[PDB]
Amino acid sequence: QDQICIGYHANNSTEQVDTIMEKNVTVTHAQDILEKKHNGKLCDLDGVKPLILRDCSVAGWLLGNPMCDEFINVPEWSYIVEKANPVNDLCYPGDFNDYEELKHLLSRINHFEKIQIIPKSSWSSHEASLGVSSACPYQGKSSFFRNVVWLIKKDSTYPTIKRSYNNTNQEDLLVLWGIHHPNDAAEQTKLYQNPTTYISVGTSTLNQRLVPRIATRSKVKGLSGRMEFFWTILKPNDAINFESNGNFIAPEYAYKIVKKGDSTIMKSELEYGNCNTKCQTPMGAINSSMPFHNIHPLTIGECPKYVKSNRLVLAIGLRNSP
Amino acid sequence: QDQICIGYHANNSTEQVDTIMEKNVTVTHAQDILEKKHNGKLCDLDGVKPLILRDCSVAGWLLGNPMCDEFINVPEWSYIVEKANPVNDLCYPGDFNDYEELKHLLSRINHFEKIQIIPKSSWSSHEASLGVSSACPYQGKSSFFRNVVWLIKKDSTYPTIKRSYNNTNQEDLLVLWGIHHPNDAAEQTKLYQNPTTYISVGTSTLNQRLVPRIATRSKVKGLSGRMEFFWTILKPNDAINFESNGNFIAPEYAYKIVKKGDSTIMKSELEYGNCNTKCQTPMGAINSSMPFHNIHPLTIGECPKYVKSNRLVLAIGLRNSP
Amino acid sequence: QDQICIGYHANNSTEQVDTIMEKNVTVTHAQDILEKKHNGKLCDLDGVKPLILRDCSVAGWLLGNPMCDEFINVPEWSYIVEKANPVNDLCYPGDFNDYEELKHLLSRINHFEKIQIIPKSSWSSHEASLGVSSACPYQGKSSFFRNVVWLIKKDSTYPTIKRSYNNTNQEDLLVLWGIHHPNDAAEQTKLYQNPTTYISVGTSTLNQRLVPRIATRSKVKGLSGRMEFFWTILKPNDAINFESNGNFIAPEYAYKIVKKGDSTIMKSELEYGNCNTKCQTPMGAINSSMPFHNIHPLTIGECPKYVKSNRLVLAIGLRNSP
Amino acid sequence: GLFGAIAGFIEGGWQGMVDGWYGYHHSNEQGSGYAADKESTQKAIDGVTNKVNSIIDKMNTQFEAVGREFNNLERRIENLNKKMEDGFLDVWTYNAELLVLMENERTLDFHDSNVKNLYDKVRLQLRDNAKELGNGCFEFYHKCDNECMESVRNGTYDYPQYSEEARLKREEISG
Amino acid sequence: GLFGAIAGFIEGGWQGMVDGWYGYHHSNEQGSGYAADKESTQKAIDGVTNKVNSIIDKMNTQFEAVGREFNNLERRIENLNKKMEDGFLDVWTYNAELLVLMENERTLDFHDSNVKNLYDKVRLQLRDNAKELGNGCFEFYHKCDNECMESVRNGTYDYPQYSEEARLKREEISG
Amino acid sequence: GLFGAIAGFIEGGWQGMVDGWYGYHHSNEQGSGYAADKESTQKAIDGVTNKVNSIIDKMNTQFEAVGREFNNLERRIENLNKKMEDGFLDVWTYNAELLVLMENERTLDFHDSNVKNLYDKVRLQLRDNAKELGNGCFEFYHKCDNECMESVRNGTYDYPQYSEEARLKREEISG
């Protein structure tokens, strides 16, 4: 007797799917929507290399920390990678004013160029090579931050300094300088003859007056003194005016800056792996069409939505009771 | 032969709808859920007019910047509209302390009333009309902020000023004052005989002592000096005590303030257009029943949820298979 | 003739449920997904009692505000409960520096132990018992904050104070101290002979110099003077160095601190109610299986999601129109 | 559809029917014509309208004001706010799109079910008194005047009243 | 409903049936009575219970502490937190409400479908050995004692056992 | 299932059918074999693929950078950022999980409906030319060679070509 029957596909597949009303429903074909894989590499972000400071902090790199690698011109970056605890930060101990906002500003830069702004050879009535410490060694020799100059009295005097720089460049330029807070009046007198001292810094926007703070402090890297750093963005064709009586850590080098966008500072122990992505993670980059992932929350770029799950499996086939 | 047939509606409608499993499905009737239309005009928020400062910043308006238009009494507003870059801000260059928190405080005000607090004629041993600058021109004539007074030495003296105001009003009142920072000791002496100078301001809450900051600065509107402004909220039955030796920009007018709610500062180039809404946008107001919109993210009022799409079309009719 | 019919359950239920297309659908059985019940009491959080300050603020409690209840050692807490406006804050009027960050830091503590660091009996050339006021009465007698000492000149001199404490403990320790801002030069002279005065405080991290601020202020609790308080976390094996000329409110007691997690400060009028939960609310605790609740937004612990509704009822039975 | 009705065995909607969404067409000795089933149509409209209104009204809307109030030394907080706004936009956009797709689909399938269920109700009314043509149309094994069909729309078809006649015509054509 | 069963061709629930969710009512010579179908009822209960449990358990809940820690010179940040909390409340409220509505509808349709599938199961079991009345009831063309209906509920109805007698009554009714 | 087909009256899938998702099996005198219904399979595949692609593509993804930039005297703001991140994670996790569950159920029910509709199309095609076995198998009242089955899958089964032989075999079977 002749027959026709209507039926559906089956296979030996073992993929399981969950349902609002059922769990572990074995099925013909399934597709995971959740991304779990990364490349283990730090990569370019949209074809733009990140700035990787290996054992240096942003501060140690901006200032010329001798223990930080020699300065290499990276004219452009998309994000910054620091390690959890860079060993090389401030060789001479102290502080950096509005440091976090500066790091955020530098997180993504379209053009960056170190530029000599006030030559060390132009300080004529002050000693510019005695401002040196064993805590900041350069080549066996005791030294100091390299883009910045620690001025010490000459002969037995410290003439009042008046110096100004006009930004004749076509870009904003980041200017950095500092104060020395010594441990006692005798160190004051010894380094800069004048006992009561100031540093005034002026711009079309800035109106600052810093006074050293003598205080007995615990030793850090063997030092009880402190270096406190400050910065501004000198607009093109504006000028910056420094005046000081002592305790002045003057600029020598500064930075041309062009900023078009923002990112952040990524903490990772990984390193560059000649690579490009649209999504970078401290554990590695992601090539992602999937709408969700579970790698790591601290991401940068057009990444899928971070989620706490091990599986988002979509049924595409049909019920398969083998 | 007799017949009964079951069938469904169709028409010539071209309205399309998308479906989880199908796209561009022509349909009988549909309804868009997404609001895309605005009125292009700045409107009242729940029938309360906004404060629209045309070419003035909040700073220029609070202090009496002459080039801000003459002060018009708006006793109440729901939100404030500034332009992207107001030309009339601080006529004399300088700064406004805690400016953003003040603007936020003023964003929505239930009652606002200017009040003479210290008459200009009550300064008997100081010059109260020589305090005038070309950076603050009124009508070709050099002038100054009108709600605040730039005090100048008389003959060759600046006696210590001791002044207090007791808030005998029934409302909190916003009080404003300032410091002058000159460029050198000679300008100091020229304006206020006394070389070492202070301004102390006291309240049940406030304990401030300001000292001018001499620094060589670049010219802004031809001036190297700077004006720095400060404020408080004087509680009813509290008093405010000023003592000054020089560089004091004294209050004359202050403001009765009652605050019951908050909004923000909207940036828009538009103008008032006699209108009322529950949702305002820098591009125009929204008459909103829809749960979603795509106009602009920076909204104020009971607005629909901002979404990035061009249409959210709901099927209501049925398939229209031709 | 014999018959078989297929049918479904019905009952006396009045339970209604809503649907995308229908409202008020009477049903056989339903289950609300929304939690609405609390126990009206303050409870332990994962078996850890909160710190409940009755009428004292955190500031009044840390310092020894005499009018705050006697200090009892609670070595551990999960969160802090204050009242909306604790009556006992700063007995002597003034301010607490970075107070909110300190409260946030203390919100959840794994170990806390008050410890004497600088004995009152060690002040020999300074008066350590004259620093007393009627606004801070202890036992009928005029007094002051109890963990901190208001030092006054002895005979007619105030020798410079140089003091250091080394954290020989194994834990971080919270150190508190203050400045007195007087009302006139004559009070300065009367309390501390020296007219121009400072307090310098140093640590491996801290480098501070405080200068008292004379300003004429309105009376608060009969006083026009002000007390300004400061704090740090002294790391183990670091030392803290004080130098002062006058106006110094020295530490006597400080606190051993161990922090393993964070919570917040809850504002509530309730009192302890011998209890344990995973979700605390100012209105009472929640024993919660439900995924949503509508009690109160200001919660602490693993709580369901706060939602604005009175009813989230899931149909489980079937249509029951009797 | 999911219920095989609308673009399955009934292949096409009726341009001619204007009164409603689902209904009937008769052809008898008095002539032919369309007529809409008011009851089911009204239930369908009420359901769909209830749906749109529930997608709209369930939205909770409070007052919020936004909002660019941080200065250029508060850009980290600016970034925190940007992550918040953008996060919410992403959430709302995704959820709105998928809600629309899903409920549109369900609406169409709802129509399917309505048409199909109407067909089944008629089918159950006549049983062996007519033949299924497959069209979603029924070929009468007897003569059905206007009262007969109007009564079918009433749901009052009296099956035994025509039982014998239908039977006779039926066994006559069967061979 | 979507499957025409529950308030469609079977119009009304059984107060009399208490044992379960879906089942049978028989009327024979030995008397009448209700009896619930254990299988379909347990399947439905497990399904709905699983649905509720999935709405509940899929929720991720971490520890949070909130939270009014900013002073009156930090009101912009306070407002950022307010926009955040309010945003999340709006999200959760909307999604919760609509989730409940959608899954309610689907649940009712699920009951509908279960009933319909049961009816169809009996239907396919008997075939032409009984007439469909429209009630959701089957009228036997033969004698079905207690054990016979027992067999119908068991799904063990032996059709050829009754086929010939049933055929006789069926065609006897034919004219 | 919801449509009683896939784990209902058809009890088992076909390992033998690989060409597609739904189809036909014949055993006639020329032998036996499987053959897939191309069209319905294409509709189902295109539909499900459309669903996955809509779940994926409807996602809006902008650039964001995160992000731990606050110091230890900015821990209140830090906590605000944590409440934000944790809130968004909770929202996305809940919504993703439930989306997956809901759409999976609908997918299976969709297959169910497709099989059922296929069965119905064939059923209406052969009418009284065959017996319904209940398995989803039809037993022919006539001789249906390979071109004939070809016509069934084509949907061009010529019913009047065989109606008479079928009536004859049927009444031959009738008693």
Ligand SMILES: *[C@@H]1O[C@H](CO)[C@@H](O[C@@H]2O[C@H](CO)[C@@H](O)[C@H](O)[C@H]2NC(C)=O)[C@H](O)[C@H]1NC(C)=O
């Ligand atoms: C920085 O130097 C430049 C070049 O000398 C100055 O630019 C000119 O300044 C004069 C007045 O000093 C103006 O009259 C011109 O209009 C300026 N020309 C350009 C190209 O800008 C600039 O003024 C200096 N900046 C400062 C603060 O003195």
Ligand SMILES: *[C@@H]1O[C@H](CO)[C@@H](O[C@@H]2O[C@H](CO)[C@@H](O)[C@H](O)[C@H]2NC(C)=O)[C@H](O)[C@H]1NC(C)=O
């Ligand atoms: C401002 O003036 C008011 C009113 O004269 C003062 O308030 C009075 O204070 C005294 C005690 O100091 C009370 O006995 C009176 O009852 C208060 N008056 C009122 C309105 O109740 C207030 O002291 C002055 N403000 C300051 C601090 O100088």
Ligand SMILES: *[C@@H]1O[C@H](CO)[C@@H](O[C@@H]2O[C@H](CO)[C@@H](O)[C@H](O)[C@H]2NC(C)=O)[C@H](O)[C@H]1NC(C)=O
């Ligand atoms: C605080 O006191 C401790 C205890 O003496 C100091 O720590 C020791 O310093 C000596 C040298 O003076 C070393 O020999 C020991 O190894 C140190 N012990 C430890 C455990 O560190 C510590 O230097 C003092 N802190 C400060 C900042 O003065």
Ligand SMILES: *[C@@H]1O[C@H](CO)[C@@H](O)[C@H](O)[C@H]1NC(C)=O
């Ligand atoms: C579902 O399947 C997984 C393995 O695929 C298993 O771990 C889990 O226990 C199963 N759940 C149940 C309750 O069957």
Ligand SMILES: *[C@@H]1O[C@H](CO)[C@@H](O)[C@H](O)[C@H]1NC(C)=O
């Ligand atoms: C949807 O409709 C537009 C016409 O308005 C058409 O251009 C587009 O390709 C359609 N999408 C598809 C491919 O279905």
Ligand SMILES: *[C@@H]1O[C@H](CO)[C@@H](O)[C@H](O)[C@H]1NC(C)=O
């Ligand atoms: C639904 O029922 C509630 C009471 O449970 C009633 O208040 C409300 O008006 C009803 N809604 C409608 C549309 O009848």
